[PDB]
Symmetry: D2
Subunit: 352 residues, 4 copies
Amino acid sequence: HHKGFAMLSIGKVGWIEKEKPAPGPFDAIVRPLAVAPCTSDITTVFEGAIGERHNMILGHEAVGEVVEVGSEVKDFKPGDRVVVPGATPDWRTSEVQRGYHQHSGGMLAGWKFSNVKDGVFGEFFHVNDADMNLAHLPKEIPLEAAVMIPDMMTTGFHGAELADIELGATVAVLGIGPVGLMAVAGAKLRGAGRIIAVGSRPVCVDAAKYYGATDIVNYKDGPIESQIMNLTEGKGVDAAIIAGGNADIMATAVKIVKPGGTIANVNYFGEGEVLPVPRLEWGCGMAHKTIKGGLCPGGRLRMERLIDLVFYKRVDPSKLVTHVFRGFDNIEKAFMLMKDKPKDLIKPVVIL
Amino acid sequence: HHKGFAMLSIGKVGWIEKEKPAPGPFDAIVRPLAVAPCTSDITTVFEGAIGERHNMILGHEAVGEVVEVGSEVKDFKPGDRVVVPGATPDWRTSEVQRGYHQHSGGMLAGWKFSNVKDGVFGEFFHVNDADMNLAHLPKEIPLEAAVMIPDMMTTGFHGAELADIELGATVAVLGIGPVGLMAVAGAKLRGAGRIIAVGSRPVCVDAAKYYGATDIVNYKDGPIESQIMNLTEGKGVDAAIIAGGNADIMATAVKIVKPGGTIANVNYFGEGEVLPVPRLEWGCGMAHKTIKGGLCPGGRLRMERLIDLVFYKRVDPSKLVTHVFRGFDNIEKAFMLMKDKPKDLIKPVVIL
Amino acid sequence: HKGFAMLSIGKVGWIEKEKPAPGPFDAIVRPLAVAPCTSDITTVFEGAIGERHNMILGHEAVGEVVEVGSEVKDFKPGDRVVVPGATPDWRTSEVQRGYHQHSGGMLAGWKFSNVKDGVFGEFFHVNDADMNLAHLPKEIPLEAAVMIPDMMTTGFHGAELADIELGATVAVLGIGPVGLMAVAGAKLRGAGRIIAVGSRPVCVDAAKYYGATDIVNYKDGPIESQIMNLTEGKGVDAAIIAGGNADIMATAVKIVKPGGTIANVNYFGEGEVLPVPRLEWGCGMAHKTIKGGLCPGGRLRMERLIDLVFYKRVDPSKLVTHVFRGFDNIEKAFMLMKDKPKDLIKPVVILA
Amino acid sequence: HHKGFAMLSIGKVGWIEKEKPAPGPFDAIVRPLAVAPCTSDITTVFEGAIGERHNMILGHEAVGEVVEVGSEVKDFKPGDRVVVPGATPDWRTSEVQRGYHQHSGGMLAGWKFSNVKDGVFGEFFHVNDADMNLAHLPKEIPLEAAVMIPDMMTTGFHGAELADIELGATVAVLGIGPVGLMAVAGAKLRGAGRIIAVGSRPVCVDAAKYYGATDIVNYKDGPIESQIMNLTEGKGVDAAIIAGGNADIMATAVKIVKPGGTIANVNYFGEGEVLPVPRLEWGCGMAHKTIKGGLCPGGRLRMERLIDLVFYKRVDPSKLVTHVFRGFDNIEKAFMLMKDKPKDLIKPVVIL
């Protein structure tokens, strides 16, 4: 028996008592040391983004301590401090041999926590294939910084990776929530010169400057496109990373990218039948404006590499954490903080 | 002075008298030996796709004989038989240094004929930068086959290039007009195993089989997405090449491509404000289904390489030519042939 | 359980061993057709991979599944399968890096007749059946299918590494069974002119069959000068090394134009150094990329290569010049590869 | 007429006066504001690296003021302060259409200054195709910083580009001269986590730490290869950038790069016939260790993008400047500084 903060049904959350998970021969049981709520947890409960769920523990961002391992786990022992990726895919599928573990076994099936499997907002959680989906966490990295790696860092950096940024290129980041702020840092880690951040909330404008943004575009001062087309003197941006906004942010991205550039989306679109690609500004189909959109990489290797970027001081994700709470109870308060969305909020963390 | 079949205004075409073009120091004057009409010309005249034009000679697909050269032209001399690419870009721009001559000087600015400059449907036409935008035509290649290289072959092959086909991958070609038929041949030249061609006219289904299609999906037997999902046993295709159809064929392509696959568009969309990307079937933004759309490569090097594939018997584009006419007078007949679209038409050629 | 094994540096014979048992994810396969390799000769008679005692040889087999572990989901006893020469462990860091050929160590993806009993036995063990087995359609004859595990995937991999562009000129150095598959692979990547370098009339004939447009005999003079004359001093866009001594590396660099690629899939078994010509490599700055890689393995690679045979994009049966029947002839076919007679490309031993 | 510091013949340098160059219609005449000597200048004179030259003005690294432009120059007028790339290629060749302007018209033919054309160590110098080979220099960037862009920065960054660094990868930089220090900075701009710099001189070891080096490997303390394998616990590096050393530094790089990694050379090798690739540590041809080696990119776009990296404070090249001189007289003394390489020297600059 263990307790966990779960989604009871649509529009309903509460604490439930559940059977403590048991590990298979290749699995591990981890208890959380620090968790953070996601905008997907809000979208899952109150908007049915993944369908109906009943008594499903929420959360997919956790650093924890290994409690038990299966008989065939060889690299992780009880007591180990580990960083747990948000996506813990099955590594023995055809999609992995194609190079897309994010979709191992189905579209976005690499993401299991709080989807097809109880999330991390519990006293314990299950990790499948520990040797492939766990990374050792150095003590030198504080917990609140490390818990930004499972999703926030790997998603934002993936946007910069998908953008195929060349050295000195001009990159626009549309949306500067916690994911967008990691896209700014990621663009700087891909050699971007000028980085134009698009957002309004002062807490995020300040963090965007910290992570490398050279320009701030407020949608209040006029259309994003015009602002960006003037900042670049009609040349456009080499790449645009979509990290937030409505479906029509796709149209904005296509309009600001020069012919031959890339639109890299890592934002979750939860409404509309269509994401609009403007026919004229996409060259009527022929502008060579590549559109990409991908779930964040997970697994052990991805986490180890992002841990090294924190360890060797190439990025400090702790500026994303605006709220830290203590105690298991405060998972509810941090979750509700993600629904209610103050103005000073980037990301909350609950330390256990 | 000379004559040419021109667009007089929206909806009106006819023969006009123009001053004979003179070459700049790097340019060449070519008289046509063989011309082909396009589907774009229909759209340009009767739908105002590129705005308003007055006395603009039409056509952009020609093989011809060099008549005069500029004072600095070094590899082409009057009398030379040349293949003229549909895209003749200015090669001294920043977009060329970025690797996108198709947009040298602006979006799709690499396409000049019958756009910003008099087309090839005249007794002569102007070719800018002869040394960079002309390719010698071997005697061994018949004219009607060679005039399928300037646009049809380079566009269809470009769709196969953009698709990032892996050896043995399953490729769908959506639309089997002349561009789609060259996309089938291009997919076969990229090592595709199974190639599923989607089209209905029997003349195109037969040419699709000839160029490498292993399956024919007729809209008759049900929705394309269910037919392809049945052929691939729920797996989908590794890549889909869009070579024709309405804006909503973009939705079809995304729905049939595996997560992680590529949608490669080389079709021109002339209607609607938006090209629809299905939000659900695009993984809500995270299915890793890359969408590309690009104008065909032009210039000398692209033509030389495509000429070599014809010379070395890797593709024979002559099966695309279903109508051959022999007079300058008959340029109008071939032009109207692309407007009326009879069911026996793939591409017409006028030999001069 | 009998098997043709390596007794030591120069001694081979049929041996009696314990029949292998499958782990929960493994399968036991009996061979239907096997082929001997040049690497087995190098292993037995030259101690290239060290000393081994009672190790069954061979790594190229198509067979019938006899038993599977309790967790195999896609393969049952009776299934006729193609077994890749490389059967890697799919749960390592190198797989997450995208290099299963080196999963667990350099070339560790190759286990048969190296770290594990080969296929020259009444049974052999396949690790991770669901990831390392491909169903073989009834339509493909056995001698054709047994060219897929190594010959086809290696030769095609050379063409893949060469980064061939449509219409490019490709040189293939060496037209043994791997080189002839490199010729076919180059033709599957859209190569225009294909220059094959080889001597034996049986192999020159197969090179023409697989797409070679030019044949270079080292007897009519040096390669380097013959190819420079064929290309009128331009060189080739890519060179695939599929045979020869260490100094063939120098030949390849000399014939590729600046910016081209040298793709090696040949195994070099003598010398401390493979020579890169300093002058013809631009003193380090000619942009002539050099690649060299072990063939891909696993289920997905075999399924895709099976589709190229099934859909008649390549027919490897022209590689099979001698077919033997019965277990007896494994020794005869194996010994045939120590001093390859001049009409031999690849031999096949059919067992059932 | 004008003066320039020239190479008279092998080993002898001196002042000569020559006809002042005149611009073609697309060219510009530039007078230097700041110059720097190169290791290529020493090698060219004292080792005959590029053959025999007589009265050839040396130097290829300069920022300057445009003095006159041809009738067709559109973006540069007399008085403009410009950054002049070391490589000023002819942009209308087939190699440009292949994407390798560094070799436009022949191997390394993109480099003209102090090679096929008088260098920058004169009162004036000629720049071909000003609109394609000149970049405006903002007043905000000091001259000694800007003169590290034409060669030092673009070469070092190109080493990082060729290395295909993934986010968090471990990179080794072999040689920490001014190019190697820019390779260190470049690796940090591609998201390298751990960067291992190999060098001895304290002025360069300290600059390497400043540019992102996390480890310094001294050739004193034992073999580099054994030293680097110890730092990485036998794993090796994901990529190695060669920026100096003997021919067998190529052997060092291959030994320290893990299977699947990349060896990227940007060092100029001036002695020996062969660069040795170790057969065993190259997987006997199959270790997937890609070897690249390329001349630095030039042209306007490359300079504009690196100017942006300086302008937006992503890299500061000024600590490469250890000696500053004032006067055209002092070019001789700075050139001699690169001959008699003191020890506190990284790069000298002559401000005019």
